[PDB]
Amino acid sequence: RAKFKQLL
Amino acid sequence: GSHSMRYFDTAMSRPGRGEPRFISVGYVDDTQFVRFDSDAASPREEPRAPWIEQEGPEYWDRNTQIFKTNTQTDRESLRNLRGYYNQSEAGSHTLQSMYGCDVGPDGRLLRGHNQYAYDGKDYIALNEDLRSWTAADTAAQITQRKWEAARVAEQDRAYLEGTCVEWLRRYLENGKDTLERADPPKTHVTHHPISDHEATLRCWALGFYPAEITLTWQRDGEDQTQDTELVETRPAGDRTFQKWAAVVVPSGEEQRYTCHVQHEGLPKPLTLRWEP
Amino acid sequence: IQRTPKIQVYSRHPAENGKSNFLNCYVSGFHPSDIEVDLLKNGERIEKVEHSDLSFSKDWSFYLLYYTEFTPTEKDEYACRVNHVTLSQPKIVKWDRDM
Ligand code: NA
Q: Where in chain C are the domains? A: 1-99
Instruction: Answer yes or no: do B242 and B187 share one domain.
Output: yes
Which of 2.60.40.10, 3.10.20.30, 3.30.710.10, 2.60.40.3080 would CATH assign to domain C1-99? 2.60.40.10
How far is C-alpha C7 from the chain's CA centre? Answer: 6
Instruction: Answer yes or no: do B244 and B206 share one domain.
Output: yes
Instruction: Answer yes or no: do B5 and B79 share one domain.
Output: yes
Helices H / strands E in chain C, number of each: 0, 9
Q: Which residue of C has its CA nearest to B231?
A: C8
Q: Do chains B and C touch (3 or more CB pairs under 8 A)?
A: yes
CB C95 within 8 A of CB C10: yes
C90 C-alpha to ligand 1 centroid (Å): 29
Instruction: Answer yes or no: do B71 and B152 share one domain.
Output: yes
Q: How was this model experimentally determined?
A: X-ray
Note the maximum CA span of chain C.
Answer: 45
Q: Which residue of A has its CA nearest to B140?
A: A8
Alpha carbon distance B34, B171 (integer Å): 12
Domain encompassing residue B197 = 182-272
3-state secondary structure chain B: CCEEEEEEEEEECCCCCCCCEEEEEEEECCEEEEEEECCCCCCCCCCECHHHHCCCHHHHHHHHHHHHHHHHHHHHHHHHHHHHCCCCCCCCCEEEEEEEEEECCCCCEEEEEEEEEECCEEEEEECCCCCCEEECCHHHHHHHHHHHHCCHHHHHHHHHHHHHHHHHHHHHHHCHHHHCCCECCEEEEEEEECCCCEEEEEEEEEEEECCCCEEEEEECCEECHHHCEECCCEECCCCCEEEEEEEEEECCCHHHEEEEEECCCCCCCEEECCCC
